[PDB]
Write an enzyme that holds these catalytic residues in place. Structure first.
Site, mmCIF file in Angstrom:
data_model
loop_
_atom_site.group_PDB
_atom_site.id
_atom_site.type_symbol
_atom_site.label_atom_id
_atom_site.label_comp_id
_atom_site.label_asym_id
_atom_site.label_seq_id
_atom_site.Cartn_x
_atom_site.Cartn_y
_atom_site.Cartn_z
ATOM 1 N N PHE A 1 2.292 2.106 -3.378
ATOM 2 C CA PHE A 1 1.265 2.293 -4.416
ATOM 3 C C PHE A 1 0.614 3.672 -4.151
ATOM 4 O O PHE A 1 0.153 4.330 -5.101
ATOM 5 C CB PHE A 1 0.486 0.976 -4.565
ATOM 6 C CG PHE A 1 -0.855 0.894 -3.899
ATOM 7 C CD1 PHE A 1 -1.585 -0.291 -3.911
ATOM 8 C CD2 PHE A 1 -1.394 2.018 -3.287
ATOM 9 C CE1 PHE A 1 -2.833 -0.341 -3.308
ATOM 10 C CE2 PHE A 1 -2.638 1.973 -2.681
ATOM 11 C CZ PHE A 1 -3.346 0.789 -2.683
ATOM 12 N N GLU B 1 -13.531 -1.400 3.457
ATOM 13 C CA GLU B 1 -12.229 -2.090 3.276
ATOM 14 C C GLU B 1 -12.250 -3.461 3.968
ATOM 15 O O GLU B 1 -12.521 -3.513 5.162
ATOM 16 C CB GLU B 1 -11.112 -1.214 3.841
ATOM 17 C CG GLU B 1 -9.758 -1.903 3.775
ATOM 18 C CD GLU B 1 -9.490 -2.581 2.442
ATOM 19 O OE1 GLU B 1 -9.069 -1.855 1.499
ATOM 20 O OE2 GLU B 1 -9.762 -3.810 2.332
ATOM 21 N N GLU C 1 -10.304 2.174 -6.427
ATOM 22 C CA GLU C 1 -9.004 1.961 -7.139
ATOM 23 C C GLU C 1 -8.801 0.442 -7.276
ATOM 24 O O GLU C 1 -7.692 -0.052 -7.005
ATOM 25 C CB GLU C 1 -7.828 2.697 -6.459
ATOM 26 C CG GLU C 1 -7.897 2.827 -4.914
ATOM 27 C CD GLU C 1 -6.669 3.357 -4.143
ATOM 28 O OE1 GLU C 1 -6.649 3.285 -2.860
ATOM 29 O OE2 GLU C 1 -5.709 3.830 -4.799
ATOM 30 N N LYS D 1 -1.898 9.974 -9.824
ATOM 31 C CA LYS D 1 -3.131 9.150 -9.846
ATOM 32 C C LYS D 1 -4.153 9.754 -8.875
ATOM 33 O O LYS D 1 -5.341 9.799 -9.215
ATOM 34 C CB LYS D 1 -2.821 7.696 -9.486
ATOM 35 C CG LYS D 1 -4.051 6.828 -9.244
ATOM 36 C CD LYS D 1 -3.718 5.455 -8.717
ATOM 37 C CE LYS D 1 -4.594 5.039 -7.552
ATOM 38 N NZ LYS D 1 -3.908 4.044 -6.694
ATOM 39 N N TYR D 2 -3.721 10.212 -7.700
ATOM 40 C CA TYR D 2 -4.645 10.725 -6.665
ATOM 41 C C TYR D 2 -5.076 12.139 -7.084
ATOM 42 O O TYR D 2 -6.269 12.478 -6.898
ATOM 43 C CB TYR D 2 -4.013 10.547 -5.283
ATOM 44 C CG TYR D 2 -3.723 9.109 -4.911
ATOM 45 C CD1 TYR D 2 -4.731 8.224 -4.556
ATOM 46 C CD2 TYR D 2 -2.430 8.617 -4.909
ATOM 47 C CE1 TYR D 2 -4.464 6.904 -4.207
ATOM 48 C CE2 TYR D 2 -2.142 7.303 -4.559
ATOM 49 C CZ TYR D 2 -3.161 6.436 -4.201
ATOM 50 O OH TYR D 2 -2.899 5.137 -3.858
ATOM 51 N N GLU E 1 -8.415 -7.654 -11.351
ATOM 52 C CA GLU E 1 -8.661 -7.725 -9.883
ATOM 53 C C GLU E 1 -10.160 -7.883 -9.629
ATOM 54 O O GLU E 1 -10.546 -8.022 -8.450
ATOM 55 C CB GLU E 1 -8.076 -6.493 -9.191
ATOM 56 C CG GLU E 1 -6.658 -6.223 -9.649
ATOM 57 C CD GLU E 1 -5.835 -5.260 -8.817
ATOM 58 O OE1 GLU E 1 -6.448 -4.498 -8.037
ATOM 59 O OE2 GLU E 1 -4.576 -5.259 -8.994
ATOM 60 N N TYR F 1 0.855 -1.217 0.000
ATOM 61 C CA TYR F 1 0.000 0.000 0.000
ATOM 62 C C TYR F 1 0.879 1.251 0.000
ATOM 63 O O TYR F 1 0.611 2.173 -0.801
ATOM 64 C CB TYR F 1 -0.900 0.060 1.221
ATOM 65 C CG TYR F 1 -2.058 -0.895 1.226
ATOM 66 C CD1 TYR F 1 -3.137 -0.717 0.365
ATOM 67 C CD2 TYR F 1 -2.114 -1.929 2.148
ATOM 68 C CE1 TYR F 1 -4.229 -1.576 0.386
ATOM 69 C CE2 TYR F 1 -3.203 -2.789 2.186
ATOM 70 C CZ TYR F 1 -4.265 -2.617 1.305
ATOM 71 O OH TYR F 1 -5.333 -3.474 1.358
ATOM 72 N N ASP G 1 -16.522 -6.572 3.103
ATOM 73 C CA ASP G 1 -16.637 -6.683 1.629
ATOM 74 C C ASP G 1 -17.776 -5.759 1.182
ATOM 75 O O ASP G 1 -18.844 -5.776 1.804
ATOM 76 C CB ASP G 1 -16.837 -8.143 1.218
ATOM 77 C CG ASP G 1 -16.759 -8.423 -0.280
ATOM 78 O OD1 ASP G 1 -17.081 -7.503 -1.081
ATOM 79 O OD2 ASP G 1 -16.392 -9.575 -0.640
ATOM 80 N N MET G 2 -17.573 -4.981 0.126
ATOM 81 C CA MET G 2 -18.647 -4.118 -0.426
ATOM 82 C C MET G 2 -19.805 -4.985 -0.931
ATOM 83 O O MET G 2 -20.919 -4.488 -1.031
ATOM 84 C CB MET G 2 -18.128 -3.222 -1.548
ATOM 85 C CG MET G 2 -17.546 -3.962 -2.748
ATOM 86 S SD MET G 2 -16.661 -2.797 -3.834
ATOM 87 C CE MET G 2 -15.121 -2.646 -2.927
HETATM 88 C C1 LIG Z 1 -6.217 -0.072 -3.177
HETATM 89 S S1 LIG Z 1 -5.971 -1.696 -3.773
HETATM 90 C C2 LIG Z 1 -7.682 -2.119 -3.530
HETATM 91 C C3 LIG Z 1 -8.104 -2.110 -2.062
HETATM 92 O O1 LIG Z 1 -9.482 -2.466 -1.990
HETATM 93 C C4 LIG Z 1 -9.761 -3.506 -1.099
HETATM 94 N N1 LIG Z 1 -10.820 -4.323 -1.662
HETATM 95 C C5 LIG Z 1 -10.785 -5.010 -2.774
HETATM 96 N N2 LIG Z 1 -11.944 -5.647 -2.974
HETATM 97 C C6 LIG Z 1 -12.737 -5.347 -1.993
HETATM 98 C C7 LIG Z 1 -14.091 -5.715 -1.578
HETATM 99 N N3 LIG Z 1 -14.836 -6.540 -2.308
HETATM 100 N N4 LIG Z 1 -14.605 -5.185 -0.466
HETATM 101 C C8 LIG Z 1 -13.848 -4.375 0.297
HETATM 102 N N5 LIG Z 1 -12.569 -4.028 -0.014
HETATM 103 C C9 LIG Z 1 -11.988 -4.462 -1.142
HETATM 104 C C10 LIG Z 1 -8.442 -4.240 -0.999
HETATM 105 O O2 LIG Z 1 -8.297 -4.969 0.267
HETATM 106 C C11 LIG Z 1 -7.388 -3.138 -1.219
HETATM 107 O O3 LIG Z 1 -6.885 -2.473 -0.031
#
Ligand SMILES: CSC[C@H]1O[C@@H](n2cnc3c(N)ncnc32)[C@H](O)[C@@H]1O
Ligand SMILES: [Cl-]
Lengths: 625, 310
Positions: A315, A380, A423, A321-322, A432, A312, A407-408
């Site tokens: 990156f 996150e 991102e 990018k930001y 990804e 992290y 998880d979203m």
């Molecule tokens: C910034 S690299 C992408 C970031 O998003 C998070 N991430 C990826 N997929 C998901 C998800 N489905 N739900 C929550 N966080 C995620 C990863 O743990 C990582 O820190």
């Protein structure tokens, strides 16, 4: 500055000579291990029983000396491929002996020539030497940019030079190499020492050698113009080449007597150092990518794995990018909340994949710039990063930021969102699983809701690199399919390589996906027009994304977001290199396939010949859901 | 050892030449061991060689000696691995040999030399593949010819003409040359392209005639007029390194090879003599000016043999 050596075919005293060359600035010497005129017989008396010693002793130099400063040279009399049995047998035996002695001394490299077309027996013999003991001593093949025969002076009345165009014919020198190399199954120990001639060939010929394994450029003193002050100098055009070769980091060699007689051999060397120091400085990108040139890394899966701290860290060390992310939100706000509604309307802004909060920080800089009110969520799944976030929210962000550790696709939101920001993008845009992640979070977007990014698209381009083809082949591992290496993408700073056609788009996704029957599964057919003779090893990948409106990011080299080093290119290799000819189309087919469990790519070349379908059923490579 | 004349002669004697007076010029190189260099010598007595104790004069060259030539009675011209052609001057009383000129014009080893009918000019064969035209007097290179597509093996000047010389190369080309023509070089070969050309000797009498020895040990008889190979014979088990014509009315041809054998051939390419005396690589040959039936052979075996030809 510039590593360089001095080739010579005459050494009375190895002691005396070596000091001299080094005095003048030469890092290494290329010289005969046996006298080049000293011809030996291995079968026929009496001269078979010639009394020794057959060369000078190893004692004359330090093991260190041999290990670092000497490159051996095959004696020129040795012609394995002779028409005459006796010469072929004797050269077989002599080549073995000389090569065997190189290794006895621990020499770091040994020079052999491709100076004719049929080098079959030579390759056979070297291949044997290679499969005898385990050594790392490189073999440098001496091949000219231009065949000596197509550089003769037209002073032979009865056999004149053909002034017809020879497109195929002026590439003959590469076919010499290509075959020799192929007979030798692409041993990593066999590289090119590329003799540059008086007259450079047509750029197309030089275009051949772009992605070939060149460790050496050989420059004869014969190619050196003389400036007013009598200095050795090179054609404007030779300079472009030397500049190119420095970028490929090669070791420049010097062959031939000091024609510029009213000067030291340093004269020649000085010019190269002169050109080198006169080259433009390394840019920001070029600084970041320093050691990662043609370095194969596994593509990151921040969905199925949790990224490390330092992952992290670096990156986030991408300012551009930001800036781009900040700006996209800046513009979205002004476009969502009228200035009359500024204090009446606070916007619900949810970062989906927050990591350690640079995007959250930029979300904050966006509001202070656009002066509107924003309610912040940070979702996150990596609970290690969630530690950094909740440490920030406690200290600086306060109750503006609700850290959601999930998880979203899981999280049931208290309220729907104006804007979602992410991102979640790999080097091939969707690798990804940004599409599946944001598809699952889309239910908690207001019907008028925006996504940043609004869209992304992968691009693919056919490439030739025997160096990366060799590097991939090298990635075989025990207790796995012997060809799994070839059926999986690699992130790599493509360097020693040749793009055979400009990129074309592969896959596109748009967020939100208001599609009634959302499917992230894809089948795409591409046709790449190629215009040189070349050999396909794989397909480079890049991407482009629309954050919002005119704000966008691209690792596409033509549209490249400048300075942005956050993504290196991706490489889809193929098991078997495919010969392509000028005119021909490379047709590739790419499939994105999914399970409940996993997503993967499959690929096939369908022209000018067929390849086997690659990663069929995700057998060699998948991405975890 | 006379003045400036070292003790040891390098083991690998590449050159054996007899002056008008019957003096013997030996050049030799070191192809083995730590010191890889060359020498020059004189034998005012023929049969005194190879012992340096009886030699009248000598010197050492920086580098080895692939080929050497007489420049009349005084001068000696050298093909040096150094990539240089060099001239040394003989003494007034002939006690010493001192370097007149040394020019590094070739980019690789210098393999062969011959001096022109004038003796005011010469031509050089190098593994850089180039052939050069030299002003012995002005010590410079008027012409560079890159006719060949491989290293140059042999360069033999016409006896009777200052513009004409043969050249043979690994590119499987034999070249007849006339500096006068705008395209000087003219390619000459048998019916079909064959084994590599290794040895060249112009006929002394008939300046339309020459001989070439292949790597296959078949010596060949070449008439330039019809430019078609009339006759060839299988003499040697190996590469024909050298071909020398006797001074005799109707000459004798001496054939030397890496088979460490010598034969002398009649005018119809028929072998009168076969000598296995040499135990290593037979490099050079000169005929006894005085006793025309005597032949003087060197080799890498450091052996100097004197021959009674039938
Ligand atoms: C910034 S690299 C992408 C970031 O998003 C998070 N991430 C990826 N997929 C998901 C998800 N489905 N739900 C929550 N966080 C995620 C990863 O743990 C990582 O820190
Ligand atoms: Cl990266």
């Amino acid at each position: 500055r510039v590593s360089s050596g001095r080739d010579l075919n005459c050494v009375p005293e190895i002691a005396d000579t070596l000091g001299a060359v080094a005095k003048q600035g030469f890092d290494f010497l290329c010289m005969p291990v046996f006298h080049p005129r000293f011809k030996r017989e291995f079968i026929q008396e009496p001269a078979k029983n010639r009394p020794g010693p057959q060369t000078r002793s190893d004692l004359l130099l330090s093991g260190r000396d041999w290990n670092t400063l000497i490159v051996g040279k095959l004696s020129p009399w040795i012609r394995p491929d002779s028409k005459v049995e006796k010469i072929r047998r004797n050269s077989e035996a002599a080549m073995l002996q000389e090569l065997n002695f190189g290794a006895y001394l621990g020499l770091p490299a040994f020079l052999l020539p491709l100076n004719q077309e049929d080098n079959t027996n030579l390759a056979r013999v070297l291949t044997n030497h290679i499969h005898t003991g385990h050594h790392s001593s490189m073999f440098w093949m001496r091949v000219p940019l231009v065949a000596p025969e197509d550089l003769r002076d037209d002073i032979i009345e009865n056999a004149p030079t053909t002034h017809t165009e020879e497109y195929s014919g002026e590439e003959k020198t590469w076919m010499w190499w290509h075959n020799f190399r192929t007979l030798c199954d692409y041993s990593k120990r066999i590289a090119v020492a590329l003799e540059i001639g008086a007259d450079l060939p047509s750029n197309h010929v030089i275009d051949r050698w772009l992605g070939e394994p060149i460790k050496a450029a050989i420059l004869p003193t014969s190619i050196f113009l003389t400036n007013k002050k009598g200095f050795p100098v090179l054609s404007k055009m030779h300079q472009r080449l030397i500049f190119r070769l420095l970028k490929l980091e090669v070791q420049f060699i010097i062959t031939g007597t000091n024609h510029h007689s009213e000067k030291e051999f340093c004269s020649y060397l000085q010019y190269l150092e002169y050109l080198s120091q006169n080259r433009p400085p390394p840019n920001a990108y070029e600084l970041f990518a320093k050691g990662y040139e043609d370095y194969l890394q596994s593509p990151l899966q921040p969905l199925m794995d949790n990224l490390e701290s330092q992952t992290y860290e670096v990156f986030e060390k991408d300012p551009i990018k930001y800036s781009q992310y900040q700006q996209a939100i800046y513009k979205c706000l002004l476009d969502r909340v009228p200035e009359e509604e500024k204090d009446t309307n606070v916007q619900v802004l949810m970062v989906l994949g927050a990591g350690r909060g640079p995007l959250v920080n930029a979300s904050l800089r966006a509001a202070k710039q656009a002066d509107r009110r924003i309610k912040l969520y940070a979702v996150e799944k990596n609970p290690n990063a969630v530690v950094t976030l909740e440490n920030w929210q406690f200290e600086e962000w306060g109750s503006q930021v609700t850290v959601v550790s999930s998880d979203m696709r899981e999280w049931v939101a208290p309220e729907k969102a104006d804007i979602i920001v992410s991102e979640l993008l790999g080097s091939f845009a969707d690798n990804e699983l940004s599409p599946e992640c944001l598809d699952g979070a889309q239910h908690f977007l207001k019907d008028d809701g925006v996504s940043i990014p609004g869209e992304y698209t992968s691009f693919l381009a056919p490439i030739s690199s025997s160096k990366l083809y060799n590097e991939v082949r090298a990635c075989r591992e025990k207790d796995r399919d012997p060809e799994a290496q070839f059926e999986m993408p690699y992130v790599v700073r493509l360097h020693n390589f040749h793009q055979l056609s400009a990129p074309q788009p592969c896959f596109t996704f748009s967020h939100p996906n208001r599609d009634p029957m959302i499917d992230n599964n894809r089948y795409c057919t591409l046709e790449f027009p190629v215009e040189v003779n070349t050999v396909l090893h794989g397909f480079a990948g890049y991407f482009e994304t629309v954050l919002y409106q005119d704000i966008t990011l691209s690792i596409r080299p033509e549209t490249h977001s400048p300075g942005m080093f956050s993504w290196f290119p991706i490489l889809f290799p193929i098991k078997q290199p495919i010969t392509v000819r000028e005119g021909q189309t490379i047709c590739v087919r790419f499939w994105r396939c999914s399970n409940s469990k996993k997503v993967w790519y499959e690929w096939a070349v369908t022209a000018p010949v067929c390849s086997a379908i690659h990663n069929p059923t995700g057998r060699s490579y998948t991405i975890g859901l | 050892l006379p003045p400036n004349a070292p003790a040891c002669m390098e083991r690998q004697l590449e050159a054996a030449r007899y002056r008008s007076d019957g003096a013997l010029l030996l050049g030799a190189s070191s192809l083995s061991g730590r010191c890889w260099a060359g020498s020059l010598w004189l034998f005012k007595d023929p049969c005194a060689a190879p012992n340096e104790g009886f030699c009248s004069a000598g010197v050492q060259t920086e580098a080895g000696v692939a080929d050497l030539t007489w420049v009349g009675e005084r001068g000696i011209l050298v093909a040096s691995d150094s990539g240089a052609v060099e001239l040394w001057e003989l003494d007034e009383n002939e006690t010493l040999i001192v370097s007149k000129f040394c020019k590094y014009e070739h980019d690789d080893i210098v393999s062969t030399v011959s001096v022109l009918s004038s003796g005011t000019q010469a031509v050089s064969g190098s593994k850089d593949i180039c052939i050069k035209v030299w002003d012995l007097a002005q010590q410079v290179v008027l012409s560079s010819y890159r006719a060949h597509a491989a290293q140059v093996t042999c360069v033999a000047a016409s006896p009777h003409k200052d513009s004409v010389f043969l050249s043979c190369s690994e590119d499987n080309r034999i070249l007849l040359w006339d500096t006068r023509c705008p395209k000087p070089a003219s390619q000459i070969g048998c019916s079909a392209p064959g084994y590599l050309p290794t040895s060249l000797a112009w006929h002394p009498q008939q300046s339309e005639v020459f001989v070439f020895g292949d790597e296959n040990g078949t010596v060949s008889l070449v008439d330039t007029k019809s430019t078609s190979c009339v006759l060839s014979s299988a003499v040697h088990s190996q590469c024909v390194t050298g071909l020398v014509f006797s001074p005799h009315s109707v000459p004798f041809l001496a054939s030397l090879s890496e088979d460490c054998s010598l034969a002398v051939l009649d005018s119809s390419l028929s072998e009168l003599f076969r000598s296995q005396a040499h135990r290593d690589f037979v490099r050079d040959a000169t005929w006894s000016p005085l006793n025309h039936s005597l032949l003087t052979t060197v080799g890498w075996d450091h052996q100097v043999v004197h021959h009674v030809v039938p």
